[PDB]
């Protein structure tokens with residue numbers, strides 16, 4: 001079939017959903033695309049190159065709230081961006097692992113620059129603006145990775161559970177992690193706000 | 204080698220530091236222990252079982268702040284627990300990845316129950332106490348993972364960002380975010396039913 005970048009990425013993302021990240025291989029991709037492995041090699045040098053491209057393309061295709069809307073508050077921007085990032089990571093099987101194992105594009109660098117510009121224009125020091133954006137990223141990625149790895153582990157004993165843990169596990173299994181995530185996200189943002197507004201005051 | 208559980212874990216953690224999580228295999232563990240694979244199999248059924256046990260033993264061995272001190276505030280407890288958790292995850296190569304997606308083990312039940320009960324004793328609902336603990340975990344795991352990954356590895360403002368980001372190992376960003384999280388929890392807890 002067609003082996004332009006877009007078609008190779010489409011096929012690989014579809015394969016990822018079938019195999020997961022550990023099972024994804026260039027050999028299986030060649031099969032999916034109806035080609036011999038040396039043919040694929042011309043287009044895609046190895047699994048690492050493949051994964052780097054997928055990670056970028058997942059965000060490029062699906063992380064559609066990467067920039068603030070005109071006039072949007074920083075609080076709202078971080079909230080929306082976090083929700084968008086989470087959605088994008090959850091869209092594919094092992095998506096967060098795919099994302100984790102890369103380092104950003106030149107395009108992603110521009111976006112981060114704009115986000116950093118935006119934060120600093122809203123009163124954050126560069127340091128605090130960065131730490132905020134980092135913390136949102138770390139929390140969001142951590143939440144998705146726990147969810148997705150937990151799912152992955154299931155494919156491979158209530159009577160002894162103590163009562164609060166039993167109830168906590170019931171609570172956590174009750175959705176895909178969204179409720180816990182959204183609650184933590186508000187706490188994170190409010191913490192940032194308390195810090196920003198303090199300026200040089202002891203807080 | 205000796206193949207009691209402790210010796211097997213010892214060997215596997217040593218191997219983990221050598222190979223990382225992806226590179227860790229039962230074949231290489233058997234080699235390290237000077238045994239054949241089917242011998243290892245009697246003791247360790249597969250990689251998932253090994254990883255599950257490593258997750259537990261890393262905390263058992265190195266997570267020293269899992270319970271509040273007598274009289275300790277919930278804020279201080281979460282701070283201390285988060286710092287301890289992070290140190291324990293950082294102790295071994297890919298430690299955060301080893302933890303990911305695990306659930307409390309039987310040997311951790313009393314501890315984790317106490318943590319949950321402790322939050323509720325401080326005014327949190329079980330739900331909100333859980334969400335606080337979970338947020339701390341998720342944030343800490345994210346922070347460590349990004350540190351462990353860019354051990355495994357232009358714009359103006361960004362460029363100074365990378366300077367501060369490379370001025371240390373991640374601890375400053377981590378600690379700053381942890382304080383934000385804790386203050387956010389406090390603001391929520393203290394609001395009760397007030398619009399906040």
Ligand SMILES: Cc1c2c(c(O)c3c(O)cccc13)C(=O)[C@]1(O)C(=O)C(C(N)=O)=C(O)[C@@H](N(C)C)[C@@H]1C2
Pocket residue numbers: 168169172262266268269284285288305306307311314315318319336339340
């Ligand atoms: C309460 C809880 C915890 C954890 C956890 O994974 C979990 C879960 O998967 C479902 C429901 C509840 C929990 C932790 O991993 C753990 O790291 C942990 O095992 C743990 C421990 N064993 O000491 C902690 O200290 C806790 N945290 C404050 C770092 C946290 C507690």
Ligand SMILES: [Cl-]
Pocket residue numbers: 001002003004
């Ligand atoms: Cl072609």
Ligand SMILES: [Cl-]
Pocket residue numbers: 004005006007
């Ligand atoms: Cl193309």
Ligand SMILES: [Cl-]
Pocket residue numbers: 024025026027046047
């Ligand atoms: Cl491959």
Ligand SMILES: [Cl-]
Pocket residue numbers: 071072073076
């Ligand atoms: Cl707004």
Ligand SMILES: [Cl-]
Pocket residue numbers: 204205206207
């Ligand atoms: Cl023995």
Ligand SMILES: [Cl-]
Pocket residue numbers: 207208209210
């Ligand atoms: Cl033993």
Ligand SMILES: [Cl-]
Pocket residue numbers: 227228229230249250
């Ligand atoms: Cl293996």
Ligand SMILES: [Cl-]
Pocket residue numbers: 274275276279
């Ligand atoms: Cl205290």
Ligand SMILES: [Cl-]
Pocket residue numbers: 164320
């Ligand atoms: Cl209780």
Ligand SMILES: [Mg+2]
Pocket residue numbers: 302305306307340
């Ligand atoms: Mg855990």
